[PDB]
Structure 1
Amino acid sequence: AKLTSAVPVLTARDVAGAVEFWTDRLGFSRDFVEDDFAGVVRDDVTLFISAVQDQVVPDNTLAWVWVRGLDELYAEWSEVVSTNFRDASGPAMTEIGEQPWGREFALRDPAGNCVHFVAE
């Protein structure tokens, strides 16, 4: 057999709001959207979004995404996402950092999930 790809599942109390942010703001496309679950895609990456009732879940939900052209993606999103991450009143992203595992930045979405984007 061969395991070929994986799809992280972000969580949210407001599923429709999460889909709108990932698509209308970050440029992912809607693969499918149901009231309690959805799938969004950009290039070879699909992210699912699932409904939850306890905010503790997205508050502890993470995902990692590998990217060719990290600075370009950061530039695009910097136009529409705040870089004041310590202000958790809304979505925001960090600056690019050089972590042991790679050059990356992270973005906290409106639901609270933290998705890290790392340069290939």
Structure 2
Amino acid sequence: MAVLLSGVPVLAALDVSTTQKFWIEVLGFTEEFLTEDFGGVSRDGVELFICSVEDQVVPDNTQAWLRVRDIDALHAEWSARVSSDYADASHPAMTAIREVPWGREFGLRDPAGNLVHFSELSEAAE
């Protein structure tokens, strides 16, 4: 029986290596593989890929959602490591946690420009 198992988002970057370095060293992901054009990282078994692109408009329009358990802990874990000045696009940044219809989440913009939403679902949203 054909069954889908899991999804892996693909982030975009002009510079895959530097973007991957941020996800590993700042955000605490583990390296899976790296090539000039394609990298992979993981944390708690959850995989993320990073692919090279030529145009900055692509990462500036690229998003992913990552579901999390204990979003408050996660935000605290990164708050000394990632700037809260989201309005300044010259560095990576993280928003405050906010309520959304389906739970709570914060946004993190990485050095390549990708916006990743870290989200904790209400049990009613399962």
TM-score by length of 2: 0.93
CA distance in 2, matches of 1:3, 1:43: 20
Deviations 1:4-53 (A, max 9, x none): 10000000001111010000110000011111100000013100000000
CA distance in 2, matches of 1:110, 1:58: 10
Q: Which runs of 5+ in 1 are unaligned?
A: none
Q: What's the counterpart of residue 107 of structure 2?
A: 106
CA distance in 2, matches of 1:40, 1:77: 17
Deviations 1:35-89 (A, max 9, x none): 1100000013100000000000000000000001111111011110000101111
Please say which structure displays the higher CA radius of gyration.
2
Counterpart amino acid of 1:23?
Answer: I
Query: Which structure 2 residues correspond to residues 51-62 of structure 1 after superposition, within 5 A?
Result: 51-62=52-63
Q: What's the counterpart of residue 26 of structure 2?
A: 25
Q: What's the counterpart of residue 15 of structure 1?
A: 16
Q: What's the counterpart of residue 78 of structure 1?
A: 79
Counterpart amino acid of 1:75?
Answer: A
Q: Which runs of 5+ in 2 are unaligned?
A: 122-126
CA distance in 2, matches of 1:52, 1:67: 28
CA distance in 1, matches of 2:102, 2:63: 16
Aligned residues: 120
CA distance in 2, matches of 1:85, 1:112: 11
TM-score by length of 1: 0.98
For residue 55 of structure 1, give the secondary structure of its aligned residue in structure 2: coil
2:65 aligned with 1:64: yes
Q: Quote the RMSD (CA, aligned, Å).
A: 0.7
Runs of 4+ aligned residues of structure 1 deviating over 4 Å after TM superposition are none
Counterpart amino acid of 1:40?
Answer: V
CA distance in 1, matches of 2:89, 2:102: 25
CA distance in 1, matches of 2:9, 2:102: 19
